[PDB]
């Protein structure tokens, strides 16, 4: 809604202190949206006290540094929460302790928090939403500098797998063309985002070398504590390799099992057949081409295999 954007801008102009949050375990969109908007606002309003809070993600810390803020600073502040569908996943819970709370998000509005709400499930990403907000904001004095442009671009390219994933829309590409005109180095950004440690590359090589496809295009990957130790990689490092199998000729759908301390993490992917159903059956869920689940025994993994084989066969 056009009016909704205008009301956010007006409300932002009214408060001297603005504190910005996003979701725990931040990703590129969390940074692009939260820090992108933070940097718009630092540039546009150098007289305001603008802060971005939360725990940093070391692999994204090259984008922006976060601030430490006292309890007192919240008093009478505007708090903006970017890219967090669920209140309980907001990094730093002092979010409702200000005078007002604003929600900006691109996920379904199941937890409709905030005094102000701008939710749009047609946007690729919240970083895209922030660029759209800026477009309007312009007319009311907002300024986009090079650092903000870069942040929003980083958020968009991270969240869409550089215009690959199906959340990419006409708007995404259009805004990216506008953003690329700012004088930041996109090639250096891509280098930083894709930089991978030799030991994670080698683990990826171990997975590729040993992968096999069923006659029906199903594939599975088991990364237990012993493999993690051999390669010296964390569980999250190994899990993040689930996307790397997508270009294999004839693959239909596949799954990763990563042994963590408390569960076995399960990541489902598909090039066609719906996997939602299968995920929900083992207590998880997600989208039709990308779901997850937690399981507690290797027996449970073999059942997920048999069902994956069938879903592919049909």
PDB file of C-alpha atoms in Angstrom:
ATOM      1  CA  UNK A   1       0.000   0.000   0.000  1.00  0.00           C
ATOM      2  CA  UNK A   2       1.227   3.478  -0.930  1.00  0.00           C
ATOM      3  CA  UNK A   3      -0.396   5.124   2.090  1.00  0.00           C
ATOM      4  CA  UNK A   4       1.208   2.605   4.452  1.00  0.00           C
ATOM      5  CA  UNK A   5       4.694   3.553   3.255  1.00  0.00           C
ATOM      6  CA  UNK A   6       3.951   7.210   3.711  1.00  0.00           C
ATOM      7  CA  UNK A   7       2.745   6.645   7.271  1.00  0.00           C
ATOM      8  CA  UNK A   8       6.008   4.750   8.116  1.00  0.00           C
ATOM      9  CA  UNK A   9       8.059   7.686   6.774  1.00  0.00           C
ATOM     10  CA  UNK A  10       5.993  10.189   8.747  1.00  0.00           C
ATOM     11  CA  UNK A  11       6.302   8.192  11.935  1.00  0.00           C
ATOM     12  CA  UNK A  12      10.138   7.904  11.375  1.00  0.00           C
ATOM     13  CA  UNK A  13      10.404  11.691  11.054  1.00  0.00           C
ATOM     14  CA  UNK A  14       8.664  12.210  14.409  1.00  0.00           C
ATOM     15  CA  UNK A  15      11.089  10.277  16.761  1.00  0.00           C
ATOM     16  CA  UNK A  16      14.572  11.407  17.929  1.00  0.00           C
ATOM     17  CA  UNK A  17      15.710   7.921  18.832  1.00  0.00           C
ATOM     18  CA  UNK A  18      15.179   4.971  16.422  1.00  0.00           C
ATOM     19  CA  UNK A  19      16.450   1.519  17.235  1.00  0.00           C
ATOM     20  CA  UNK A  20      16.382  -1.211  14.630  1.00  0.00           C
ATOM     21  CA  UNK A  21      16.094  -5.009  15.049  1.00  0.00           C
ATOM     22  CA  UNK A  22      15.927  -8.115  12.895  1.00  0.00           C
ATOM     23  CA  UNK A  23      15.722 -11.918  13.330  1.00  0.00           C
ATOM     24  CA  UNK A  24      18.101 -14.153  15.346  1.00  0.00           C
ATOM     25  CA  UNK A  25      20.763 -15.918  13.216  1.00  0.00           C
ATOM     26  CA  UNK A  26      20.835 -13.129  10.723  1.00  0.00           C
ATOM     27  CA  UNK A  27      21.218 -13.746   6.959  1.00  0.00           C
ATOM     28  CA  UNK A  28      21.922 -11.290   4.083  1.00  0.00           C
ATOM     29  CA  UNK A  29      18.312 -10.017   3.959  1.00  0.00           C
ATOM     30  CA  UNK A  30      18.385  -9.292   7.759  1.00  0.00           C
ATOM     31  CA  UNK A  31      21.510  -7.178   7.206  1.00  0.00           C
ATOM     32  CA  UNK A  32      20.314  -5.472   4.035  1.00  0.00           C
ATOM     33  CA  UNK A  33      16.952  -4.508   5.436  1.00  0.00           C
ATOM     34  CA  UNK A  34      17.935  -3.571   9.054  1.00  0.00           C
ATOM     35  CA  UNK A  35      21.320  -2.028   8.245  1.00  0.00           C
ATOM     36  CA  UNK A  36      20.217  -0.633   4.905  1.00  0.00           C
ATOM     37  CA  UNK A  37      17.425   1.266   6.584  1.00  0.00           C
ATOM     38  CA  UNK A  38      19.752   2.219   9.466  1.00  0.00           C
ATOM     39  CA  UNK A  39      22.199   3.762   7.023  1.00  0.00           C
ATOM     40  CA  UNK A  40      19.394   5.617   5.053  1.00  0.00           C
ATOM     41  CA  UNK A  41      18.384   7.093   8.300  1.00  0.00           C
ATOM     42  CA  UNK A  42      21.854   8.018   9.583  1.00  0.00           C
ATOM     43  CA  UNK A  43      22.434   9.868   6.304  1.00  0.00           C
ATOM     44  CA  UNK A  44      19.025  11.514   6.108  1.00  0.00           C
ATOM     45  CA  UNK A  45      18.845  12.405   9.892  1.00  0.00           C
ATOM     46  CA  UNK A  46      22.273  13.097  11.340  1.00  0.00           C
ATOM     47  CA  UNK A  47      20.588  14.838  14.327  1.00  0.00           C
ATOM     48  CA  UNK A  48      18.782  11.594  15.415  1.00  0.00           C
ATOM     49  CA  UNK A  49      20.141   8.771  17.577  1.00  0.00           C
ATOM     50  CA  UNK A  50      19.950   5.757  15.262  1.00  0.00           C
ATOM     51  CA  UNK A  51      21.056   2.259  16.422  1.00  0.00           C
ATOM     52  CA  UNK A  52      21.077  -1.233  14.954  1.00  0.00           C
ATOM     53  CA  UNK A  53      21.100  -3.982  17.492  1.00  0.00           C
ATOM     54  CA  UNK A  54      21.528  -7.724  17.787  1.00  0.00           C
ATOM     55  CA  UNK A  55      24.169 -10.487  17.654  1.00  0.00           C
ATOM     56  CA  UNK A  56      26.352 -10.281  14.572  1.00  0.00           C
ATOM     57  CA  UNK A  57      26.908 -13.061  12.045  1.00  0.00           C
ATOM     58  CA  UNK A  58      30.738 -13.291  11.636  1.00  0.00           C
ATOM     59  CA  UNK A  59      30.551 -14.200   7.857  1.00  0.00           C
ATOM     60  CA  UNK A  60      28.438 -11.088   7.174  1.00  0.00           C
ATOM     61  CA  UNK A  61      30.237  -8.733   9.590  1.00  0.00           C
ATOM     62  CA  UNK A  62      32.058  -7.147   6.643  1.00  0.00           C
ATOM     63  CA  UNK A  63      28.646  -5.514   5.723  1.00  0.00           C
ATOM     64  CA  UNK A  64      28.072  -3.486   8.876  1.00  0.00           C
ATOM     65  CA  UNK A  65      28.846  -3.418  12.623  1.00  0.00           C
ATOM     66  CA  UNK A  66      26.099  -3.371  15.256  1.00  0.00           C
ATOM     67  CA  UNK A  67      25.659  -1.202  18.332  1.00  0.00           C
ATOM     68  CA  UNK A  68      25.406  -1.808  22.019  1.00  0.00           C
ATOM     69  CA  UNK A  69      22.549   0.092  23.556  1.00  0.00           C
ATOM     70  CA  UNK A  70      21.495   0.659  27.165  1.00  0.00           C
ATOM     71  CA  UNK A  71      18.020  -0.063  28.463  1.00  0.00           C
ATOM     72  CA  UNK A  72      17.488   3.663  29.023  1.00  0.00           C
ATOM     73  CA  UNK A  73      17.903   4.509  25.295  1.00  0.00           C
ATOM     74  CA  UNK A  74      14.616   2.630  24.545  1.00  0.00           C
ATOM     75  CA  UNK A  75      12.550   5.064  26.619  1.00  0.00           C
ATOM     76  CA  UNK A  76      10.350   7.031  24.226  1.00  0.00           C
ATOM     77  CA  UNK A  77      12.113   5.524  21.142  1.00  0.00           C
ATOM     78  CA  UNK A  78      10.694   4.215  17.891  1.00  0.00           C
ATOM     79  CA  UNK A  79      11.633   0.560  17.398  1.00  0.00           C
ATOM     80  CA  UNK A  80      11.588  -0.924  13.916  1.00  0.00           C
ATOM     81  CA  UNK A  81      11.701  -4.670  13.396  1.00  0.00           C
ATOM     82  CA  UNK A  82      12.751  -5.899   9.928  1.00  0.00           C
ATOM     83  CA  UNK A  83      12.329  -9.339   8.431  1.00  0.00           C
ATOM     84  CA  UNK A  84      10.954 -11.265  11.495  1.00  0.00           C
ATOM     85  CA  UNK A  85       7.648 -13.063  11.217  1.00  0.00           C
ATOM     86  CA  UNK A  86       7.600 -14.227  14.877  1.00  0.00           C
ATOM     87  CA  UNK A  87       8.103 -12.053  17.838  1.00  0.00           C
ATOM     88  CA  UNK A  88      10.067 -14.682  19.698  1.00  0.00           C
ATOM     89  CA  UNK A  89      12.702 -14.841  16.984  1.00  0.00           C
ATOM     90  CA  UNK A  90      13.477 -11.111  17.237  1.00  0.00           C
ATOM     91  CA  UNK A  91      17.142 -10.661  18.164  1.00  0.00           C
ATOM     92  CA  UNK A  92      17.159  -8.516  21.258  1.00  0.00           C
ATOM     93  CA  UNK A  93      13.782  -8.727  22.997  1.00  0.00           C
ATOM     94  CA  UNK A  94      13.682  -5.159  24.303  1.00  0.00           C
ATOM     95  CA  UNK A  95      11.837  -4.406  21.031  1.00  0.00           C
ATOM     96  CA  UNK A  96       8.415  -3.586  22.648  1.00  0.00           C
ATOM     97  CA  UNK A  97       9.945  -1.309  25.301  1.00  0.00           C
ATOM     98  CA  UNK A  98       9.901   1.855  23.182  1.00  0.00           C
ATOM     99  CA  UNK A  99       7.093   4.325  22.631  1.00  0.00           C
ATOM    100  CA  UNK A 100       6.157   2.691  19.285  1.00  0.00           C
ATOM    101  CA  UNK A 101       6.862  -0.501  17.381  1.00  0.00           C
ATOM    102  CA  UNK A 102       6.909  -0.809  13.546  1.00  0.00           C
ATOM    103  CA  UNK A 103       6.942  -4.132  11.670  1.00  0.00           C
ATOM    104  CA  UNK A 104       8.368  -4.374   8.119  1.00  0.00           C
ATOM    105  CA  UNK A 105       8.322  -7.875   6.716  1.00  0.00           C
ATOM    106  CA  UNK A 106       7.790 -10.020   3.640  1.00  0.00           C
ATOM    107  CA  UNK A 107       6.589 -13.232   5.336  1.00  0.00           C
ATOM    108  CA  UNK A 108       2.951 -14.229   6.090  1.00  0.00           C
ATOM    109  CA  UNK A 109       1.371 -12.067   8.776  1.00  0.00           C
ATOM    110  CA  UNK A 110       0.608 -14.787  11.310  1.00  0.00           C
ATOM    111  CA  UNK A 111       1.964 -12.731  14.221  1.00  0.00           C
ATOM    112  CA  UNK A 112       0.537  -9.314  13.450  1.00  0.00           C
ATOM    113  CA  UNK A 113       2.593  -7.278  15.889  1.00  0.00           C
ATOM    114  CA  UNK A 114       3.297  -3.589  15.844  1.00  0.00           C
ATOM    115  CA  UNK A 115       1.549  -0.212  16.177  1.00  0.00           C
ATOM    116  CA  UNK A 116       2.428   0.123  12.480  1.00  0.00           C
ATOM    117  CA  UNK A 117       2.551  -2.860  10.056  1.00  0.00           C
ATOM    118  CA  UNK A 118       3.848  -3.024   6.530  1.00  0.00           C
ATOM    119  CA  UNK A 119       3.811  -6.665   5.398  1.00  0.00           C
ATOM    120  CA  UNK A 120       3.992  -7.630   1.713  1.00  0.00           C
ATOM    121  CA  UNK A 121       4.345 -11.273   0.790  1.00  0.00           C
ATOM    122  CA  UNK A 122       4.753 -10.358  -2.882  1.00  0.00           C
ATOM    123  CA  UNK A 123       8.183  -8.768  -2.208  1.00  0.00           C
ATOM    124  CA  UNK A 124      11.252 -10.909  -2.862  1.00  0.00           C
ATOM    125  CA  UNK A 125      12.787  -9.797   0.336  1.00  0.00           C
ATOM    126  CA  UNK A 126      12.682  -7.113   2.978  1.00  0.00           C
ATOM    127  CA  UNK A 127      15.719  -5.432   1.455  1.00  0.00           C
ATOM    128  CA  UNK A 128      13.539  -4.907  -1.660  1.00  0.00           C
ATOM    129  CA  UNK A 129      10.825  -3.436   0.624  1.00  0.00           C
ATOM    130  CA  UNK A 130      13.378  -1.029   2.053  1.00  0.00           C
ATOM    131  CA  UNK A 131      14.348   0.172  -1.457  1.00  0.00           C
ATOM    132  CA  UNK A 132      10.649   0.663  -2.241  1.00  0.00           C
ATOM    133  CA  UNK A 133      10.277   2.643   1.013  1.00  0.00           C
ATOM    134  CA  UNK A 134      13.252   4.795   0.022  1.00  0.00           C
ATOM    135  CA  UNK A 135      11.766   5.493  -3.430  1.00  0.00           C
ATOM    136  CA  UNK A 136       8.778   7.074  -1.699  1.00  0.00           C
ATOM    137  CA  UNK A 137      10.913   8.559   1.071  1.00  0.00           C
ATOM    138  CA  UNK A 138      12.947  10.481  -1.490  1.00  0.00           C
ATOM    139  CA  UNK A 139      10.098  13.012  -1.863  1.00  0.00           C
ATOM    140  CA  UNK A 140      10.219  13.624   1.871  1.00  0.00           C
ATOM    141  CA  UNK A 141      14.009  14.189   1.941  1.00  0.00           C
ATOM    142  CA  UNK A 142      15.427  10.657   2.311  1.00  0.00           C
ATOM    143  CA  UNK A 143      18.966  10.123   1.077  1.00  0.00           C
ATOM    144  CA  UNK A 144      20.492   6.886  -0.171  1.00  0.00           C
ATOM    145  CA  UNK A 145      24.335   6.824   0.015  1.00  0.00           C
ATOM    146  CA  UNK A 146      26.774   4.249  -1.348  1.00  0.00           C
ATOM    147  CA  UNK A 147      26.990   2.142   1.777  1.00  0.00           C
ATOM    148  CA  UNK A 148      23.145   1.813   1.981  1.00  0.00           C
ATOM    149  CA  UNK A 149      22.963   0.966  -1.682  1.00  0.00           C
ATOM    150  CA  UNK A 150      25.466  -1.730  -1.223  1.00  0.00           C
ATOM    151  CA  UNK A 151      23.651  -3.097   1.830  1.00  0.00           C
ATOM    152  CA  UNK A 152      20.312  -3.325   0.069  1.00  0.00           C
ATOM    153  CA  UNK A 153      21.948  -4.943  -2.961  1.00  0.00           C
ATOM    154  CA  UNK A 154      23.699  -7.461  -0.723  1.00  0.00           C
ATOM    155  CA  UNK A 155      20.372  -8.292   0.900  1.00  0.00           C
ATOM    156  CA  UNK A 156      18.627  -8.757  -2.454  1.00  0.00           C
ATOM    157  CA  UNK A 157      21.426 -10.864  -4.028  1.00  0.00           C
ATOM    158  CA  UNK A 158      21.798 -12.979  -0.882  1.00  0.00           C
ATOM    159  CA  UNK A 159      18.052 -13.627  -0.538  1.00  0.00           C
ATOM    160  CA  UNK A 160      17.443 -14.526  -4.240  1.00  0.00           C
ATOM    161  CA  UNK A 161      20.680 -16.531  -4.786  1.00  0.00           C
ATOM    162  CA  UNK A 162      21.741 -13.655  -7.207  1.00  0.00           C
ATOM    163  CA  UNK A 163      18.353 -13.624  -9.118  1.00  0.00           C
ATOM    164  CA  UNK A 164      18.084 -17.433  -9.255  1.00  0.00           C
ATOM    165  CA  UNK A 165      15.409 -18.344  -6.716  1.00  0.00           C
ATOM    166  CA  UNK A 166      11.694 -18.042  -7.542  1.00  0.00           C
ATOM    167  CA  UNK A 167      11.140 -15.075  -5.038  1.00  0.00           C
ATOM    168  CA  UNK A 168      12.906 -12.979  -7.760  1.00  0.00           C
ATOM    169  CA  UNK A 169      10.330 -10.633  -9.471  1.00  0.00           C
ATOM    170  CA  UNK A 170      10.338  -7.845 -12.002  1.00  0.00           C
ATOM    171  CA  UNK A 171      10.824  -5.366  -9.139  1.00  0.00           C
ATOM    172  CA  UNK A 172      13.845  -7.141  -7.813  1.00  0.00           C
ATOM    173  CA  UNK A 173      15.736  -6.900 -11.053  1.00  0.00           C
ATOM    174  CA  UNK A 174      14.600  -3.317 -11.648  1.00  0.00           C
ATOM    175  CA  UNK A 175      15.756  -2.132  -8.257  1.00  0.00           C
ATOM    176  CA  UNK A 176      19.044  -4.013  -8.607  1.00  0.00           C
ATOM    177  CA  UNK A 177      19.708  -2.069 -11.824  1.00  0.00           C
ATOM    178  CA  UNK A 178      19.022   1.155  -9.958  1.00  0.00           C
ATOM    179  CA  UNK A 179      21.238   0.103  -7.066  1.00  0.00           C
ATOM    180  CA  UNK A 180      24.210  -1.042  -9.172  1.00  0.00           C
ATOM    181  CA  UNK A 181      24.705   2.551 -10.398  1.00  0.00           C
ATOM    182  CA  UNK A 182      26.035   3.462  -6.905  1.00  0.00           C
ATOM    183  CA  UNK A 183      29.845   3.461  -6.795  1.00  0.00           C
ATOM    184  CA  UNK A 184      30.411   0.303  -4.666  1.00  0.00           C
ATOM    185  CA  UNK A 185      32.215  -2.701  -6.028  1.00  0.00           C
ATOM    186  CA  UNK A 186      29.743  -5.462  -6.756  1.00  0.00           C
ATOM    187  CA  UNK A 187      32.537  -7.849  -7.785  1.00  0.00           C
ATOM    188  CA  UNK A 188      34.227  -7.467  -4.389  1.00  0.00           C
ATOM    189  CA  UNK A 189      30.862  -7.959  -2.629  1.00  0.00           C
ATOM    190  CA  UNK A 190      30.335 -11.239  -4.535  1.00  0.00           C
ATOM    191  CA  UNK A 191      33.809 -12.336  -3.599  1.00  0.00           C
ATOM    192  CA  UNK A 192      33.081 -11.749   0.084  1.00  0.00           C
ATOM    193  CA  UNK A 193      29.687 -13.433  -0.011  1.00  0.00           C
ATOM    194  CA  UNK A 194      31.011 -16.553  -1.871  1.00  0.00           C
ATOM    195  CA  UNK A 195      34.385 -16.977  -0.167  1.00  0.00           C
ATOM    196  CA  UNK A 196      34.606 -20.531   1.124  1.00  0.00           C
ATOM    197  CA  UNK A 197      37.337 -22.076   3.368  1.00  0.00           C
ATOM    198  CA  UNK A 198      39.386 -24.828   1.837  1.00  0.00           C
ATOM    199  CA  UNK A 199      38.170 -27.398   4.372  1.00  0.00           C
ATOM    200  CA  UNK A 200      34.475 -26.733   3.541  1.00  0.00           C
ATOM    201  CA  UNK A 201      35.382 -26.944  -0.206  1.00  0.00           C
ATOM    202  CA  UNK A 202      36.986 -30.319   0.424  1.00  0.00           C
ATOM    203  CA  UNK A 203      33.910 -31.577   2.300  1.00  0.00           C
ATOM    204  CA  UNK A 204      31.803 -30.393  -0.689  1.00  0.00           C
ATOM    205  CA  UNK A 205      34.176 -32.411  -2.842  1.00  0.00           C
ATOM    206  CA  UNK A 206      33.723 -35.501  -0.716  1.00  0.00           C
ATOM    207  CA  UNK A 207      29.908 -35.156  -1.073  1.00  0.00           C
ATOM    208  CA  UNK A 208      30.025 -34.662  -4.906  1.00  0.00           C
ATOM    209  CA  UNK A 209      32.494 -37.543  -5.407  1.00  0.00           C
ATOM    210  CA  UNK A 210      30.364 -40.040  -3.508  1.00  0.00           C
ATOM    211  CA  UNK A 211      26.826 -38.918  -4.499  1.00  0.00           C
ATOM    212  CA  UNK A 212      24.593 -41.377  -6.345  1.00  0.00           C
ATOM    213  CA  UNK A 213      21.195 -41.063  -7.921  1.00  0.00           C
ATOM    214  CA  UNK A 214      18.459 -43.739  -7.794  1.00  0.00           C
ATOM    215  CA  UNK A 215      16.792 -44.714 -11.094  1.00  0.00           C
ATOM    216  CA  UNK A 216      14.045 -42.303  -9.994  1.00  0.00           C
ATOM    217  CA  UNK A 217      16.359 -39.304  -9.375  1.00  0.00           C
ATOM    218  CA  UNK A 218      16.419 -39.424  -5.566  1.00  0.00           C
ATOM    219  CA  UNK A 219      19.688 -38.701  -3.680  1.00  0.00           C
ATOM    220  CA  UNK A 220      20.699 -38.623  -0.039  1.00  0.00           C
ATOM    221  CA  UNK A 221      23.663 -37.309   1.951  1.00  0.00           C
ATOM    222  CA  UNK A 222      24.714 -38.455   5.452  1.00  0.00           C
ATOM    223  CA  UNK A 223      27.181 -36.234   7.345  1.00  0.00           C
ATOM    224  CA  UNK A 224      27.787 -37.788  10.770  1.00  0.00           C
ATOM    225  CA  UNK A 225      30.107 -36.602  13.626  1.00  0.00           C
ATOM    226  CA  UNK A 226      32.974 -38.685  12.205  1.00  0.00           C
ATOM    227  CA  UNK A 227      32.881 -36.864   8.767  1.00  0.00           C
ATOM    228  CA  UNK A 228      32.605 -33.452  10.469  1.00  0.00           C
ATOM    229  CA  UNK A 229      35.741 -34.334  12.491  1.00  0.00           C
ATOM    230  CA  UNK A 230      37.686 -35.625   9.487  1.00  0.00           C
ATOM    231  CA  UNK A 231      37.012 -32.397   7.534  1.00  0.00           C
ATOM    232  CA  UNK A 232      37.109 -30.072  10.617  1.00  0.00           C
ATOM    233  CA  UNK A 233      33.810 -28.453   9.668  1.00  0.00           C
ATOM    234  CA  UNK A 234      30.892 -27.376  11.775  1.00  0.00           C
ATOM    235  CA  UNK A 235      27.433 -28.867  11.420  1.00  0.00           C
ATOM    236  CA  UNK A 236      26.067 -25.635  10.033  1.00  0.00           C
ATOM    237  CA  UNK A 237      28.933 -25.541   7.458  1.00  0.00           C
ATOM    238  CA  UNK A 238      28.000 -29.014   6.267  1.00  0.00           C
ATOM    239  CA  UNK A 239      24.237 -28.277   6.227  1.00  0.00           C
ATOM    240  CA  UNK A 240      24.769 -25.173   4.093  1.00  0.00           C
ATOM    241  CA  UNK A 241      26.059 -27.422   1.310  1.00  0.00           C
ATOM    242  CA  UNK A 242      22.583 -28.916   0.735  1.00  0.00           C
ATOM    243  CA  UNK A 243      21.925 -26.489  -2.232  1.00  0.00           C
ATOM    244  CA  UNK A 244      25.064 -27.571  -4.082  1.00  0.00           C
ATOM    245  CA  UNK A 245      23.548 -30.737  -5.632  1.00  0.00           C
ATOM    246  CA  UNK A 246      20.818 -28.810  -7.660  1.00  0.00           C
ATOM    247  CA  UNK A 247      22.539 -28.932 -11.065  1.00  0.00           C
ATOM    248  CA  UNK A 248      23.085 -32.668 -11.264  1.00  0.00           C
ATOM    249  CA  UNK A 249      21.574 -34.104 -14.437  1.00  0.00           C
ATOM    250  CA  UNK A 250      18.519 -36.181 -13.623  1.00  0.00           C
ATOM    251  CA  UNK A 251      18.245 -35.260  -9.930  1.00  0.00           C
ATOM    252  CA  UNK A 252      14.532 -34.878  -8.817  1.00  0.00           C
ATOM    253  CA  UNK A 253      14.760 -34.369  -5.056  1.00  0.00           C
ATOM    254  CA  UNK A 254      17.300 -35.035  -2.337  1.00  0.00           C
ATOM    255  CA  UNK A 255      17.927 -34.833   1.341  1.00  0.00           C
ATOM    256  CA  UNK A 256      20.849 -33.993   3.800  1.00  0.00           C
ATOM    257  CA  UNK A 257      21.137 -35.570   7.317  1.00  0.00           C
ATOM    258  CA  UNK A 258      23.670 -33.650   9.455  1.00  0.00           C
ATOM    259  CA  UNK A 259      24.433 -35.006  12.946  1.00  0.00           C
ATOM    260  CA  UNK A 260      24.359 -32.154  15.482  1.00  0.00           C
ATOM    261  CA  UNK A 261      24.724 -32.516  19.284  1.00  0.00           C
ATOM    262  CA  UNK A 262      20.976 -32.852  20.046  1.00  0.00           C
ATOM    263  CA  UNK A 263      19.194 -33.874  16.764  1.00  0.00           C
ATOM    264  CA  UNK A 264      19.915 -34.948  13.236  1.00  0.00           C
ATOM    265  CA  UNK A 265      19.024 -31.888  11.059  1.00  0.00           C
ATOM    266  CA  UNK A 266      17.121 -32.792   7.896  1.00  0.00           C
ATOM    267  CA  UNK A 267      17.105 -30.555   4.790  1.00  0.00           C
ATOM    268  CA  UNK A 268      14.882 -31.449   1.826  1.00  0.00           C
ATOM    269  CA  UNK A 269      15.226 -29.985  -1.651  1.00  0.00           C
ATOM    270  CA  UNK A 270      13.428 -30.660  -4.940  1.00  0.00           C
ATOM    271  CA  UNK A 271      13.625 -29.736  -8.615  1.00  0.00           C
ATOM    272  CA  UNK A 272       9.944 -30.549  -9.067  1.00  0.00           C
ATOM    273  CA  UNK A 273       8.122 -33.003  -6.795  1.00  0.00           C
ATOM    274  CA  UNK A 274       6.574 -31.412  -3.668  1.00  0.00           C
ATOM    275  CA  UNK A 275       8.470 -32.198  -0.461  1.00  0.00           C
ATOM    276  CA  UNK A 276       6.313 -30.267   1.961  1.00  0.00           C
ATOM    277  CA  UNK A 277       4.117 -33.268   2.648  1.00  0.00           C
ATOM    278  CA  UNK A 278       7.090 -35.512   3.398  1.00  0.00           C
ATOM    279  CA  UNK A 279       8.602 -32.936   5.796  1.00  0.00           C
ATOM    280  CA  UNK A 280       5.296 -32.507   7.773  1.00  0.00           C
ATOM    281  CA  UNK A 281       5.101 -36.302   8.134  1.00  0.00           C
ATOM    282  CA  UNK A 282       8.413 -36.238  10.100  1.00  0.00           C
ATOM    283  CA  UNK A 283       7.367 -33.158  12.203  1.00  0.00           C
ATOM    284  CA  UNK A 284       8.901 -30.442  10.064  1.00  0.00           C
ATOM    285  CA  UNK A 285       7.605 -28.445   7.134  1.00  0.00           C
ATOM    286  CA  UNK A 286       8.596 -25.637   4.773  1.00  0.00           C
ATOM    287  CA  UNK A 287       7.969 -24.803   1.082  1.00  0.00           C
ATOM    288  CA  UNK A 288       7.300 -27.372  -1.644  1.00  0.00           C
ATOM    289  CA  UNK A 289      10.852 -27.215  -3.074  1.00  0.00           C
ATOM    290  CA  UNK A 290      12.649 -26.512   0.228  1.00  0.00           C
ATOM    291  CA  UNK A 291      11.669 -27.901   3.649  1.00  0.00           C
ATOM    292  CA  UNK A 292      13.312 -29.018   6.919  1.00  0.00           C
ATOM    293  CA  UNK A 293      12.739 -31.358   9.869  1.00  0.00           C
ATOM    294  CA  UNK A 294      14.533 -32.505  13.094  1.00  0.00           C
ATOM    295  CA  UNK A 295      14.780 -36.308  13.737  1.00  0.00           C
ATOM    296  CA  UNK A 296      16.334 -38.401  16.583  1.00  0.00           C
ATOM    297  CA  UNK A 297      17.511 -41.646  15.210  1.00  0.00           C
ATOM    298  CA  UNK A 298      19.113 -43.044  12.073  1.00  0.00           C
ATOM    299  CA  UNK A 299      16.194 -45.456  11.744  1.00  0.00           C
ATOM    300  CA  UNK A 300      13.993 -42.404  11.190  1.00  0.00           C
ATOM    301  CA  UNK A 301      16.388 -41.279   8.367  1.00  0.00           C
ATOM    302  CA  UNK A 302      16.009 -44.627   6.494  1.00  0.00           C
ATOM    303  CA  UNK A 303      12.189 -44.212   6.578  1.00  0.00           C
ATOM    304  CA  UNK A 304      12.575 -40.699   5.155  1.00  0.00           C
ATOM    305  CA  UNK A 305      14.665 -42.319   2.433  1.00  0.00           C
ATOM    306  CA  UNK A 306      12.075 -44.924   1.485  1.00  0.00           C
ATOM    307  CA  UNK A 307       9.434 -42.213   1.346  1.00  0.00           C
ATOM    308  CA  UNK A 308      11.681 -39.910  -0.678  1.00  0.00           C
ATOM    309  CA  UNK A 309      12.271 -42.665  -3.185  1.00  0.00           C
ATOM    310  CA  UNK A 310       8.483 -43.130  -3.595  1.00  0.00           C
ATOM    311  CA  UNK A 311       7.720 -39.439  -3.918  1.00  0.00           C
ATOM    312  CA  UNK A 312      10.293 -39.366  -6.713  1.00  0.00           C
ATOM    313  CA  UNK A 313       9.130 -42.588  -8.363  1.00  0.00           C
ATOM    314  CA  UNK A 314       5.691 -40.984  -8.629  1.00  0.00           C
TER     315      UNK A 314
END
